[model samples]
Target: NEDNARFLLLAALIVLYLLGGAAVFSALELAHERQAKQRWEERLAQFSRGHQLSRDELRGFLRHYEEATRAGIRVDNVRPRWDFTGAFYFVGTVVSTIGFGMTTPATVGGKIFLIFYGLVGCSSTILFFNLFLERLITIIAYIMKSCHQRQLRRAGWKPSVYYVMLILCTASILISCCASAMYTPIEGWSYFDSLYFCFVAFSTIGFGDLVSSQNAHYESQGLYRFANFVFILMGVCCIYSLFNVISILIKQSLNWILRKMD
Candidate 1:
């Protein structure tokens, strides 16, 4: 019950944040749209005063108005909606498998730095999540201690929890290794390349180069097709599991640190 309560609280907070963001974006977009309309009206009036407008001229004017409106609303890229904010969260939440694929750096240095950034970001995200999990566990344990002390003592479920945690850790590592292997050959990369790609992809850096492609031909034995399919399948699960593990560890660690501070 305690664990559920904490999770519910966190979930509620996340929902509130998302709703707030949506509201803000909606207002911002509307404001920009209105401004864009006003600009278009001014441009149209100027054109009407200057000369007769042809069909093509009107089309071009409309296009310019559209572009201007887009720029105002920060929809500068051809990507999907909420691209900028989504990109930021995607970069930070690589393990969450919510790769919005909105923005990416073009330079080699940028790609390399992105890899490193993902490494750090993923670790930190995991740590925070784990710390939260730890606190939740502690709260649950305390509740059990209070409400069912005798039953809890008899059950003595510590060893079972330890075993479950161990299995989860092992599974995460195995999945990551499998995903790394699958991505390497498909990417036509060395072992390190494979490792780096796995790390980045799972962490959500998603540099795009090492991503799965149907066109890659290796030995003409349908290697690319096979590898790409497996790589994507494995990547999704591995990334999700890693994020879950990280969240649990992070939450627990944070609670411990905060408790010590207090």
Candidate 2:
């Protein structure tokens, strides 16, 4: 009875803690949205003040801005033609199956190359993911063992692989949240939209609805592109690791249940 009471109290505290975090996150999201809206308004006002234009000219400018935003072009900067870095990014997307379809080959030769490239790239990506998944599971095992040792003083203690799985799943969520927070300002995206993009991209369900390339400001910087590439690669691995771990757990549970029934 005492253990049951303690468990109930602990669970209640955890629920409250989570609720508090949700409240704080919501407030921050609201603040960021207001700031983005204000910044865009200020920019529009500045443009109006700088150029004394007739109504038609102003309307044209607004129309152009609307078109650019709809196309996901955040800035009116001159972007360079396709280069090595761009090619690398394209290849990465094709292989990872996160093909945004923002750009496509214009020629027959390029299209044929893409088909072959995708075949090889897909196999290579899966191989890499498998290797990373093994390493991640090893790390999780180490963590579980460490945790078990720490709780050795407790009665009937056992290693809880489910606890480790919970930790990893939580970490994955936090990673996506951090990515969304970083991208909201950089990409001029709403916080929810940024979060949605992270989930879609990491899940390899690239709907091509929202893409990072819309933020030309970030795309122009070589360092940013490199860092972004690394983030996507690592994020995908983390997601796959989670998937593989959960799959193992589910299979084990099913087998155990069947044995008990027999």
**What are the per-model numbers of colliding residue pairs?**
20, 0
Q: Relative to the true structure, how large is the alpha-carbon lDDT of every model?
A: 0.59, 0.74
- The parts of candidate 1 lying over 4 Å away from their true place are 1-165, 182-187, 214-227
Q: Write the per-residue lDDT of candidate 2 for residues 129-217, one digit (tens) a residue.
A: 99876666577677767787889968233336677578668878988877776776666778989888888899898998886753345
RMSD to true structure for each model, in Å:
17.1, 11.0
lDDT of 1: 0.59
Which RMSD does model 2 reach against the true structure? 11.0
Q: Runs in model 2 with CA error above 4 Å?
A: 1-81, 143-161, 249-262
Q: State candidate 1's TM-score.
A: 0.36
lDDT of 2 at 156: 39
Give the C-alpha lDDT of model 2: 0.74
What would the per-residue lDDT of candidate 1 be over residues 77-113, giving only the tens digit for each residue?
A: 3323234643444454354444534344545786787
Q: TM-score for each prediction?
A: 0.36, 0.60
